[PDB]
Amino acid sequence: GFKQDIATIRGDLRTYAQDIFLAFLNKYPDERRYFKNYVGKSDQELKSMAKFGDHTEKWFNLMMEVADRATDCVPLASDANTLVQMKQHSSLTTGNFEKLFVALVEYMRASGQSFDSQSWDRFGKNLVSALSSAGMK
Amino acid sequence: GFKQDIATIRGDLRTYAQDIFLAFLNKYPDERRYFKNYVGKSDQELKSMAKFGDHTEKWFNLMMEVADRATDCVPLASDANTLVQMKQHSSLTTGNFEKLFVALVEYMRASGQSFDSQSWDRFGKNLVSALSSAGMK
Ligand code: HEM
Ligand code: HEM
Numbered sequence: 121g122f123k124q125d126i127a128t129i130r131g132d133l134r135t136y137a138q139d140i141f142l143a144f145l146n147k148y149p150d151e152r153r154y155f156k157n158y159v160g161k162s163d164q165e166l167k168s169m170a171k172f173g174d175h176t177e178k179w180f181n182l183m184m185e186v187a188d189r190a191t192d193c194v195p196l197a198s199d200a201n202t203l204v205q206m207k208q209h210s211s212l213t214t215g216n217f218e219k220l221f222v223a224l225v226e227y228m229r230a231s232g233q234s235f236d237s238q239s240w241d242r243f244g245k246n247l248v249s250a251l252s253s254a255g256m257k
Numbered sequence: 258g259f260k261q262d263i264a265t266i267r268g269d270l271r272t273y274a275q276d277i278f279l280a281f282l283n284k285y286p287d288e289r290r291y292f293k294n295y296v297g298k299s300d301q302e303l304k305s306m307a308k309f310g311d312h313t314e315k316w317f318n319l320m321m322e323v324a325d326r327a328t329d330c331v332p333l334a335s336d337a338n339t340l341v342q343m344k345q346h347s348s349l350t351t352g353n354f355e356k357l358f359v360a361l362v363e364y365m366r367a368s369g370q371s372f373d374s375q376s377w378d379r380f381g382k383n384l385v386s387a388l389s390s391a392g393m394k
Contacts (some may be wrong), residue, residue, distance in 0.1 A: 121286050123299045124279075192297065234283040 122239035125228075126187050129180065134173055137180035142166065144223040151219065154211055186247070193243040200250035213257050214248045221248070259330060259376040262365075263321050271310055274317035279303075281360040288356060291348070323384070330380040337387030350394050351385045358385070 129136045142163050145152055152158045158166060166172045186199040203209060221244025228235035266273045279300055282289050289295055295303055303309040323336040340346060358381025365372035 121282060121289055121296075123297055123302075124283075127299050127301075236283075236286040239286065 121236045122187070122193055122243065125235050125240070126184050128233060128235070130184055133180055133184070134177050137176045138167055138173055140224050140227050141176045141179070143227040144220050147223045147226070148219050151216065154216065187243060190243065190246075193239050194246045195243070195250050197250060197254065200247065200254040204251055204254045204256045214251050217244070217248050217251060220244070258373045259324070259380070262372050262377070263324050265370060265372070266317065267321055270317055270321070271314045274313045275304065275310065277317070277361050277364050278313045280364040281357050284360045284363065285356045288353065291353075324380060327380060327383075330376050331383050332380070332387055334387055334391065337384060338391045340384075341388055341391040341393045346393075351388050354381070354385050354388060354393075357381075 145158065145166075146163075157169065158172075161169075186195050186203075187193075189196050189199060221241065224244065225237050225241045228237040228240055282292075282295075294306070295309065298306070319339075323332050323340075326333050326336060358378065361381070362374050362378045365374040365377060
């Protein structure tokens with residue numbers, strides 16, 4: 121289930137983080153404009169960049185903490201507030217998060233690993249609701 | 258064959274019981290709703306909870322008794338009736354049991370351990386028929 125999926129991702133986090141982030145950027149290539157130095161690169165070029173794995177792991181490290189602090193896939197309001205107020209997220213709207221979760225759920229459904237993809241879809245919807253409650257446009 | 262599989266499973270009943278029950282919940286995550294104390298718990302947290310190990314072993318012990326009393330994977334009607342009339346099963350339907358046997362057979366086919374997975378599938382089919390005959394919806 122969802123709780124065990126957090127443990128599965130944490131046991132191979134850099135690989136899952138990069139693979140899910142690449143699935144996101146490949147499904148929604150214009151989302152590269154929120155980043156720097158990602159356009160014009162294949163997946164293997166991105167994975168050999170100095171910062172790509174490190175930044176994407178830091179993302180997913182915090183995402184798994186937000187998932188782990190949730191109750192029944194409902195995140196803490198304090199975690200949502202942090203994600204709204206982060207300077208790095210000042211250009212974002214809830215739509216950016218909705219696209220991330222579409223891509224993450226599609227990746228889980230296609231994976232050989234037995235993820236509870238429906239719970240991840242609910243967690244993303246509840247996270248988006250919490251971002252809106254915390255004032256993200 | 259099927260009789261050796263009962264001996265394999267019995268030899269390490271707690272481990273097989275827990276592994277097959279978690280394979281069931283992983284393939285059909287919605288089924289966790291019938292186990293309210295397992296919601297939101299990692300697999301290692303479940304294995305720390307006395308009743309997870311105890312109840313799951315006792316489930317599979319009874320399954321192995323029913324399997325052993327069967328003739329050519331046809332279970333006794335009396336055994337199907339015990340399962341229908343258990344108060345812990347009062348809100349189940351035959352589809353719950355069908356899903357358990359799909360997951361069990363998948364687990365056996367994926368395992369390194371030899372199993373007569375076709376016999377477990379047919380046992381499950383014949384048990385579901387018997388549960389329906391005994392009045393399960
Ligand atoms: C639940 C989802 C998310 C979490 C937990 C999260 C977390 C983080 C964290 C921890 C950082 C700091 C990375 C570092 O400095 O090394 C970061 C940076 C950033 N995040 Fe998010 N983020 C999420 C979703 C998003 C989404 C959906 C976007 C845009 C589509 C985005 C865009 C950015 C950008 C542009 C940065 C800074 C640039 C970069 O690290 O390359 N984030 N995020
Ligand atoms: C052939 C299949 C099955 C057998 C042999 C079986 C057997 C048992 C046994 C013996 C118990 C009592 C545990 C104890 O004394 O500690 C039990 C409880 C229970 N069973 Fe079943 N069961 C079967 C299938 C299922 C299925 C498919 C479900 C739900 C999807 C289910 C749900 C429950 C629940 C909720 C309880 C009570 C809580 C618990 O003890 O875990 N069982 N079962």
